[PDB]
Amino acid sequence: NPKDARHDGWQTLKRFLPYLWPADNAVLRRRVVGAILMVLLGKATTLALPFAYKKAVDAMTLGGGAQPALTVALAFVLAYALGRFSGVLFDNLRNIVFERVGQDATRHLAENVFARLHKLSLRFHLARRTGEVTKVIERGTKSIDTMLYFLLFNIAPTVIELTAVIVIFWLNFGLGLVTATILAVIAYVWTTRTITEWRTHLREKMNRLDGQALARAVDSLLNYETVKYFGAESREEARYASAARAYADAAVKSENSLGLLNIAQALIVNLLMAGAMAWTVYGWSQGKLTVGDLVFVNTYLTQLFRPLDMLGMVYRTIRQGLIDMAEMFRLIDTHIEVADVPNAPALVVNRPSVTFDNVVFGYDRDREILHGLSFEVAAGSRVAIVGPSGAGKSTIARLLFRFYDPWEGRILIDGQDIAHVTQTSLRAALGIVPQDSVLFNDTIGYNIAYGRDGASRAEVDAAAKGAAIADFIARLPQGYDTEVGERGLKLSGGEKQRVAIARTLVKNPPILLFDEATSALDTRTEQDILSTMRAVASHRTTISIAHRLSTIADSDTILVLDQGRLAEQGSHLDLLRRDGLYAEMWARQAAESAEVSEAA
Amino acid sequence: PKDARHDGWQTLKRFLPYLWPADNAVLRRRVVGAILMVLLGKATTLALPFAYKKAVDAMTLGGGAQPALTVALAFVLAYALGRFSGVLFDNLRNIVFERVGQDATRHLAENVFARLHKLSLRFHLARRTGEVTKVIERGTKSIDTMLYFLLFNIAPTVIELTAVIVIFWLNFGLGLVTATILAVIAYVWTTRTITEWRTHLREKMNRLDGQALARAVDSLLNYETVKYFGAESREEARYASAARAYADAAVKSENSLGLLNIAQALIVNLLMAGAMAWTVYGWSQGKLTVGDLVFVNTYLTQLFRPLDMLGMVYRTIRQGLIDMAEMFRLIDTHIEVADVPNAPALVVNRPSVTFDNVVFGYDRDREILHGLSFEVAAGSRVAIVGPSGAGKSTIARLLFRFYDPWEGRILIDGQDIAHVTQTSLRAALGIVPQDSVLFNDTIGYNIAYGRDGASRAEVDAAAKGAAIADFIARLPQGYDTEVGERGLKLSGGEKQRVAIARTLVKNPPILLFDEATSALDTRTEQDILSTMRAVASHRTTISIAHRLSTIADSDTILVLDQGRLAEQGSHLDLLRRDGLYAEMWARQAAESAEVSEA
Ligand SMILES: CCCCCCCCCCCC[N+](C)(C)[O-]
Ligand SMILES: CCCCCCCCCCCC[N+](C)(C)[O-]
């Protein structure tokens, strides 16, 4: 098992490797091979071209053997130029061929994570800001992309070139030259890395200061009115200036450190250049080496170290990318709380009854909320679930949609345990109008059609009619194509709730849940929407979970929960007669509204 | 001056005073040092190939192995030391200059910030924090990258190109000079024209990326709804198609980069081939040494290495200039509301407020006030109410002189507020707005904001007067509790109380409640009305309210209709007149009944 290993960068890359080498595409595998061949050709070319340069010099200094020297030197000089162009060509061709491979690999990693995030449990509560999340994901995407690019097209070719240069130097020079360049690379890498760590820290500080300065400016600009009201212009200006100065100081330190790293690198490289060139000319003095050799060695070294100029950045980036990618994999690795059983059958709703059978549940194991809740909702009946603050009624919908499983007990629809069926068929049987309904960032027509996968214009028109939102949409300039949500037209609470009702209407489920559906509405809006809800509950099993009893007073039967159990059951009149928990609650709510009516 | 072509040149010419300040002698010295480092660095990079040529020359002359080894050693060593020295000079110019760069861009930002504060409210500064922050981040990065590329890439390259032209001229060709000149011209032209297309492809890729990402985020943030409609596969597919569109666009963009690079390499390498071949030919005739070959080669490579990333540089410099131009446009934008020359301070001895035949609208095609006149006696509690066309929402903004009347005038005490300093005027005014805003800071910072040097005692007093003091006492950090986001979040009543407290710290003779209770629930409204009444004690108070019952206890009530004063008087006088106020009153009462009926 690959996961049975140390949690380092090597493990992350090993995990990513199947995406690059899919074994499902074969089109991409060919692209990978071709890209690797462009790498090899590009390297062969850049290694070859200095020899062409060396020989051109040799022909000019030892015209004795290669004549007409002019002809020989011309041929080699042209070979060198053509070689240079060829190296660039091979390199860009490998980039181009690979880019599809990279984009595909990362797209699939993203897709896998997205699917997994949809499979994970609600308790992670993905209720956060769009901007924060988007900035984070943007940042991570740029990071993983940069890491992948530097890895494949900078580090890898450089290892190829470094080994090649080592072999060639070995056969043809020194070999003290080999040890010298190897020690030089080792010093260069070690220096770059240790300096880069410090630099990354300064970078983080600088970035934090920048954010602080920017936030002060933005808080001021968005609150221009308040700054005017209190004549606070100078105060705001000063307040920005101090932060701006802190940032500038940090930035100065950060860029200064860049200069130190550059100087260190150039010092190492140039010591090696001096040593190698001196050694080469000295070797020439003894008739051991040609003068082309000087040119050869110099060129080979500059070609070697040119990709390593960036190494600090490359390092910082590769590291961050690896971290970010490990995070991807961690999510993919996190286990799924609610899963279908193996070979789970579909739920088959012939008669849409709902049973709670001795249900024990809580969100967390240290706080049990339902303590053995049992009840039967008859097929086609309209029932309400009410209770005081500790009843556990807010769990019901989430249990029914199997966002969570009971600790003990079970829930049945039409005699089938909902834990043992496919989640999709189960959810297919259920409609919900929640308290706060959320709209996608898209058109109102899209938001209504969302109830069913292939929803037609006719179906949407029908639902919007049944939701009595059809006219409101007709009066919109752009109609069903009116964009809604944030960054879109703002809808009133009743309008949004109507879109939600319409949505479930498009769904057309046998069982429907009103989950505090009117609880966030004003009184008149509530009274308006209740008649619509009454209509849409027509021939379905309807469970209405409500705070305000008067809104559910017309139910076929009412389930009264107290302390995570069924305390009271019956019609509104039966419950008023029993003079128990429901009656008390009723009385209290009546009193409240009277008091509210008093204040005029 | 500004009377110029308005190209990159004008933007840069404007920016030069920031780089060469005339207020900071130290930064001016830093600029001189940086320029010296540019000149040393260039001199070094031009010199070091000559050291190389001669080392080659020594090994070719070169008759035997006698004193050449020493000379060749000396010259290779000079070459290596030259390389290192050039880098050292380059980083030293960067290090020396960086402070100049940081200060210049800081002062430019500071100027834009200050002008934005002087500019009109009408610049509709209602936006999302993330968007504005994103735009400013992008722009700062833009101007920075631009400034760096301009100073430390383009300029040294111009120096080097001229130097290379002169040197090639004196020592070669001059077919070599023209050949390199043509090489650069073709190189730049090609890079530019390809880059324009590339920037377009980049923009497409970015919109596509934004769309895919938006789809994913909208899905994840709506996990509940997606579960409710069993819509996971659908969202997955929705993301996948967007993701593919993006990937395709990215591939096109990078392909175009490959094409630009290949074209560039074609130009560079043709020039290389030609120069070196011609040099070898000259050598064959003894006109040129063989060191000359390397010399030529090194010069050309050194020349073209900065022009490797010219595309990016170009794109960047372009965008930077655009963004900087934008900055300058704001600084240039004219200020709608200004103090008159030598404007006296406003002096409030008796805090009356007069509207004298005020004609106003936010835009000249929609007139809102049609000649509004009224008098508010010093120390009275007055309310301003009206039906939908009254123009009452203008009053506060007019009184604080966010705008001037098209016609007519506003007086405080006896003085036209258009002829006094804006600061003295706003110092006499306190406001509690409908939506009260908290800065992202402590509660104490937020209350103390009312007066510039406000003490903790003053904050305590204001918070006491606003009756929010107990609430703060029960906070662990008390007045040092952070609020806003991410800070402790306050109820509407708590926020309105902080707003009241802020105004108490100002302690103004004139206080405006501008739909102050409009966003509050009923109980909160009733609670805060006693605090508001108490806080009105020895000030002139003007309350603009939608709901008449909240202002029925006023000294006098001004009723506006169609931008003029329709009716005036006490609540009872107005009910007796059986006019507009009475009707409104009846209607609201009926409405309150209806809600209570249901
Ligand atoms: C907090 C980490 C959660 C991230 C997982 C979400 C995966 C889908 C988003 C990938 C977007 C790819 N992009 C930006 C190139 O379009
Ligand atoms: C699969 C390619 C696109 C995936 C998007 C990148 C994810 C963002 C990084 C997640 C968390 C980063 N970290 C470790 C700094 O917290």
Ligand SMILES: CCCCCCCCCCCC[N+](C)(C)[O-]
């Ligand atoms: C509508 C956009 C307004 C742009 C003008 C605002 C300039 C204020 C300074 C913010 C710069 C922050 N910085 C430099 C520290 O990153």
Ligand SMILES: CCCCCCCCCCCC[N+](C)(C)[O-]
């Ligand atoms: C340290 C840098 C301070 C300089 C201020 C830069 C803020 C740039 C905002 C530019 C926005 C212009 N626009 C509309 C073209 O996007």
